[PDB]
Amino acid sequence: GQHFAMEPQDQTAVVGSRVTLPCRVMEKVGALQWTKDDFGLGQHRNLSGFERYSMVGSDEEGDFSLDIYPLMLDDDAKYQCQVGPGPQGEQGIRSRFAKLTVLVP
Amino acid sequence: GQHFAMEPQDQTAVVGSRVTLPCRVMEKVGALQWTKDDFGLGQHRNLSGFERYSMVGSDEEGDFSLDIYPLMLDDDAKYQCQVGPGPQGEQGIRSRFAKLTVLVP
Ligand SMILES: *[C@@H]1O[C@H](CO)[C@@H](O)[C@H](O)[C@H]1NC(C)=O
Numbered sequence: 001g002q003h004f005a006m007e008p009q010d011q012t013a014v015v016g017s018r019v020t021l022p023c024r025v026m027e028k029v030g031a032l033q034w035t036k037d038d039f040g041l042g043q044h045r046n047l048s049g050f051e052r053y054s055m056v057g058s059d060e061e062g063d064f065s066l067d068i069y070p071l072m073l074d075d076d077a078k079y080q081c082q083v084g085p086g087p088q089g090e091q092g093i094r095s096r097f098a099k100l101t102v103l104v105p
Numbered sequence: 106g107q108h109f110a111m112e113p114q115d116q117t118a119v120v121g122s123r124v125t126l127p128c129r130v131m132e133k134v135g136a137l138q139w140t141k142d143d144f145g146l147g148q149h150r151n152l153s154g155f156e157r158y159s160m161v162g163s164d165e166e167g168d169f170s171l172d173i174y175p176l177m178l179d180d181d182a183k184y185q186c187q188v189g190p191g192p193q194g195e196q197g198i199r200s201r202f203a204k205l206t207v208l209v210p
């Protein structure tokens with residue numbers, strides 16, 4: 001079944017930098033999406049309106065990491081990697097929540 | 106900018122019945138999506154992967170209410186209607202949370 005090969009971890013970073021929240025999925029059947037404070041960022045890598053977020057990894061590798069750049073204070077939140085159910089009855093999955101902390105020097 | 110003309114409220118319903126959670130957005134610019142216990146259900150009206158759920162209403166009335174039939178005990182959860190940011194900076198919005206309570210006959 002579909003499952004995480006890698007899940008995001010708590011991170012602390014400095015404003016202005018790039019951050020990568022890791023998410024790798026094996027045997028992905030459902031549609032994938034990140035939540036930020038439980039707000040859905042978009043499925044199928046389509047993050048319209050979030051000009052500083054992207055998901056440039058490849059499907060083959062199951063790379064669905066979230067990149068953020070440049071980091072801003074508003075990005076200080078809790079993030080989760082989500083995969084919806086498959087068309088064949090495959091259940092969806094949810095990664096641990098990762099707390100992204102933003103510092104200012 | 107985009108705003109809610111209707112938000113979902115708490116409902117109690119019995120297994121087997123139809124339940125529609127209302128969501129209406131005027132001047133909608135972003136992509137709308139429901140969450141179920143903070144899990145994004147999808148950004149298309151058909152909501153693939155959730156075989157008993159769909160989003161009903163006309164785009165011209167910004168009606169994207171969450172239609173559930175037949176109701177199952179699995180549907181007992183908290184629901185939110187969300188609209189993502191627009192392509193021109195317009196900020197996303199989030200409805201109140203509606204608690205759906207499902208009873209057995
Ligand atoms: C992503 O969503 C936007 C907003 O609806 C749409 O205009 C665009 O075509 C989509 N991008 C892709 C590659 O599907």
Ligand SMILES: *[C@@H]1O[C@H](CO)[C@@H](O)[C@H](O)[C@H]1NC(C)=O
Nearest residue numbers: 087148149150151152153154
């Ligand atoms: C659901 O809607 C999307 C967008 O219109 C479409 O790509 C997809 O094929 C639809 N699903 C079915 C089963 O028709």
Ligand code: NA
Nearest residue numbers: 151152155158
């Ligand atoms: Na569906």
